[PDB]
């Protein structure tokens, strides 16, 4: 949300799930955020290089955070070079 | 029975959204709900619907970005002239700066914003948001 | 003085965290008051809003107990509701509001119509529900003021926001729910997606991975 | 009846897991040793954690006692417990797969696997 | 000749561990990674797909600064032997046993502990600790046979988590993967640390 000259004005831009696109609300502990480390060509972990996903506590109260973390970490990965 | 085909496919359309899923199916198919759908998505609020052949009424499948709060049907078709519109916001949507009501005027379906820019009036088919 | 048993208190006493939304971003749980104090305790107000006297019957009579309603709230979009029972009425407001101040929320506040200023009312429709008791609040243009009773009055006006309007349904009597319908009302503002969120979210390393290092020790 | 208190047990329990080196399974040594190590305001109480740790010494013997962390008999289970065989207790030579996983193999393109054969 | 790549030998050795065998039961969120059903009732899981996940769990751990801010615990004795080994190993800390309720929740009780990530053998028996999770923004990594619930599982690695050999030789192979890409020890299939200490011995 922004005024009408410009100036930003919410409090802060709440995260969003990455599978559902739901808002994370500052009280929803049941939500996570997962780092996806990424591997250079002789499969070592770069340091400070990773993939961020955040999953809402609804997604993962329903037991599907796996199978759509899994299919997105896949999308990631193949657009990444990650492999 | 089936009196309102247009609101089974609003009614689905949210219950998946709510339930997460990325697609959704849409039985029967009907022109209303093409024109509805067509709308809903020149606003973003959908990604790409697919018509599929039966030779029957036919079948969409409709992808789901995660933008839509709600979907509805309104019935009975109310008449609203181009003076009501304000008034069937305020009662329909949760804000004035964002959020539509779909009307079905002589110029074609169509947004309550552009029956506005238009002055045209007609009858109310549903909302979204 | 105050030694801090959480990683979020340890970060927030080496001033590592010096802003609120940096914990509200993350959803990070707050286990001590003393956090809240640090980060916005000058400007926090509080108010006993009840004190509500409850029994257990018991072979030789009744146990009362009091029931201590409090509300702490910056006026700035933070607000915060504290329940606490206890034999003694000071114990149970000091209960109340440790727990109120544990419990300060973000409030998004938004416009009405044309977005000039800072925001007055709530960003948009929103409904809570305690028990019986559901609240529900509607945009209010500029002027119009906080149209709603005493309880829910005093919790928007701790909240910040200027002008709104307010429909209250069943027993509003019970100011225990009625309070909270209103907070519940009042937390939904920021859960509701708005176009202005459509943009993809770009993450921030969590307090606890950016300060690991710290907090290692 | 004769049920050892809350603070008889936890006594005799610190004291065997702070003076195990010293404790025997005689009743009057033991008691010198907690009178010697522990100071215990009644006689009938160093009498009566005496006699307990009695009991608790001779139940270590025969083996551990829940509840009592002795260091050396961690350190000798650790020992003990550190220790590998020979020959690993898993036999890739020869893997008996049932036709399913040998589809599975196949579809995962791993159907040359050695060592894989048919019931 | 013809040596083997990195994955087909742990293929090999979780196929002697009999890693690929299920239960007579499948749960609808884990039959994504069931290859098939065999006449007798039991389900074979995908090997394929159970590296691929051991390899995303590894990817994961890597990127946790800290190793103590992992928190591995099974409540079954199987698994116990292999949970201490893997937090000897990557460095990270171990609870073999029962799990004290509130220790993720209760800041003032003595365990109480703030992991940032948790890693479970299995999440029917790890029930408590995973319900507890939840309250506290832990993401979970869990060992999921085909009947293991899915609820507060972000990363499910479909395996048999119920034999000691196949739990302890998937304890051995995570603790690799994280190893090597860390950077600590040579690439490939083998690795100095012997299979068997990871297993259950009477
Ligand atoms: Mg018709």
């Not at chain 2, 029957?56 to 008449?79: A, H, Q, T």
């Not at chain 3, 990070?28 to 509080?46: A, C, N, V």
Request: charged share 25%; glycine share 8%.
């Amino acid at each position: 949300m922004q005024n009408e000259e410009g100036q930003n004005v919410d409090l802060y831009i709440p995260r969003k799930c990455s599978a559902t696109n739901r808002v994370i609300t500052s009280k929803d502990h049941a939500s996570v955020q997962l780092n996806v480390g990424h591997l250079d060509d002789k499969g070592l972990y770069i340091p400070g290089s990773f993939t961020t996903f955040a999953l809402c506590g609804f997604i993962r109260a329903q037991g599907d955070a796996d199978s759509a973390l899994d299919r997105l970490w896949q999308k990631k990965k193949v657009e990444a070079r990650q492999q | 029975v089936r009196v309102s085909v247009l609101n089974d496919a609003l009614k689905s359309m949210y219950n998946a959204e709510k339930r997460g899923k990325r697609q959704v199916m849409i039985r029967p198919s009907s022109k209303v709900i093409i024109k509805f759908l067509i709308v809903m998505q020149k606003h973003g609020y959908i990604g790409e619907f697919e018509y599929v052949d039966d030779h029957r009424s036919g079948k969409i499948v409709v992808e789901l970005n995660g933008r839509l709060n709600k979907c509805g049907v309104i019935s009975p078709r109310f008449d609203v002239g181009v003076k009501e519109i304000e008034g069937w916001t305020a009662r329909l949507l949760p804000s004035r700066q964002f959020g539509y009501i779909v009307l079905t005027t002589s110029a074609g379906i169509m947004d309550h914003e552009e029956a506005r820019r238009k002055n045209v009036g007609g009858k109310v088919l549903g909302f979204f948001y | 003085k105050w030694v801090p048993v959480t990683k979020l208190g340890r970060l927030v006493k080496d001033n590592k965290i010096r802003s609120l939304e940096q914990i509200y971003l993350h959803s990070l749980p707050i286990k001590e008051f003393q956090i809240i104090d640090t980060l916005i305790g000058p400007s926090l107000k509080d108010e006993v809003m009840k004190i509500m006297p409850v029994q257990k019957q018991t072979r030789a009579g009744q146990r009362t107990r009091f029931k201590a309603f409090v509300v702490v709230g910056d006026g700035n979009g933070h607000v915060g509701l504290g329940v606490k029972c206890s034999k003694e009425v000071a114990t149970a407001i000091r209960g109340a509001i440790i727990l109120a101040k544990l419990s300060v929320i973000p409030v998004r506040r938004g416009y009405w119509g044309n977005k000039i200023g800072k925001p007055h009312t709530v960003p948009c429709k929103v409904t809570g529900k305690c028990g019986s008791v559901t609240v529900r609040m509607v945009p209010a243009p500029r002027g119009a003021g906080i149209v709603a009773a005493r309880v829910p009055k005093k919790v928007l006006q701790f909240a910040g926001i200027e002008d709104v309007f307010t429909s209250s349904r069943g027993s509003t009597k019970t100011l225990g729910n009625f309070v909270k319908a209103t907070f519940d009302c009042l937390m939904k503002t920021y859960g509701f997606l708005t176009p202005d969120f459509w943009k993809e979210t770009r993450f921030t390393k969590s307090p606890f991975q950016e300060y690991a290092d710290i907090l290692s020790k | 009846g004769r049920v050892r208190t809350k603070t008889v047990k936890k006594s005799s329990r610190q004291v065997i897991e702070r003076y195990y080196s010293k404790m025997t399974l005689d009743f009057h040594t033991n008691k010198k040793i907690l009178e010697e190590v522990a100071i215990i305001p009644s006689k009938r109480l160093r009498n009566k954690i005496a006699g307990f740790s009695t009991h608790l010494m001779k139940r270590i013997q025969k083996g551990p006692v829940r509840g009592i962390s002795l260091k050396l008999q961690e350190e000798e289970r650790e020992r003990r417990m550190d220790f590998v065989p020979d020959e690993s207790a898993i036999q890739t030579d020869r893997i008996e797969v049932d036709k399913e996983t040998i589809d599975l193999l196949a579809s995962l393109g791993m159907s040359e696997l050695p060592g894989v054969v048919l019931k | 000749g013809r040596t083997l790549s990195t994955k087909e030998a742990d293929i090999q050795m979780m196929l002697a561990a009999e890693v690929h065998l299920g239960t007579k039961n499948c749960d609808f969120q884990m039959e994504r990674y069931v290859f098939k059903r065999r006449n007798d009732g039991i389900y074979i899981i995908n090997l394929g797909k159970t590296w691929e996940k051991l390899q995303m769990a590894a990817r994961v751990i890597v990127a946790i600064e800290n190793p103590k801010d992992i928190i591995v615990q099974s409540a079954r004795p199987y698994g116990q032997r292999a949970v201490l080994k893997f937090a000897q190993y990557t460095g990270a800390n171990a609870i073999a046993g029962r799990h004290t309720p509130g220790t993720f929740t209760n800041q003032l009780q003595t365990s109480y502990s703030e992991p940032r990530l948790l890693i479970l053998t299995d999440p029917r028996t790890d029930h408590q600790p995973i319900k507890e999770a939840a309250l506290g923004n832990i993401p979970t990594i869990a060992f999921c046979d085909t009947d293991s619930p899915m609820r507060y599982v972000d990363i499910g690695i479909p395996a048999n988590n119920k034999g000691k050999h196949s739990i302890g030789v998937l304890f051995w192979l995570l603790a690799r993967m994280v190893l090597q890409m860390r950077g600590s020890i040579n690439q490939g299939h083998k690795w100095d640390v012997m299979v068997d200490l990871f297993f259950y011995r009477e």
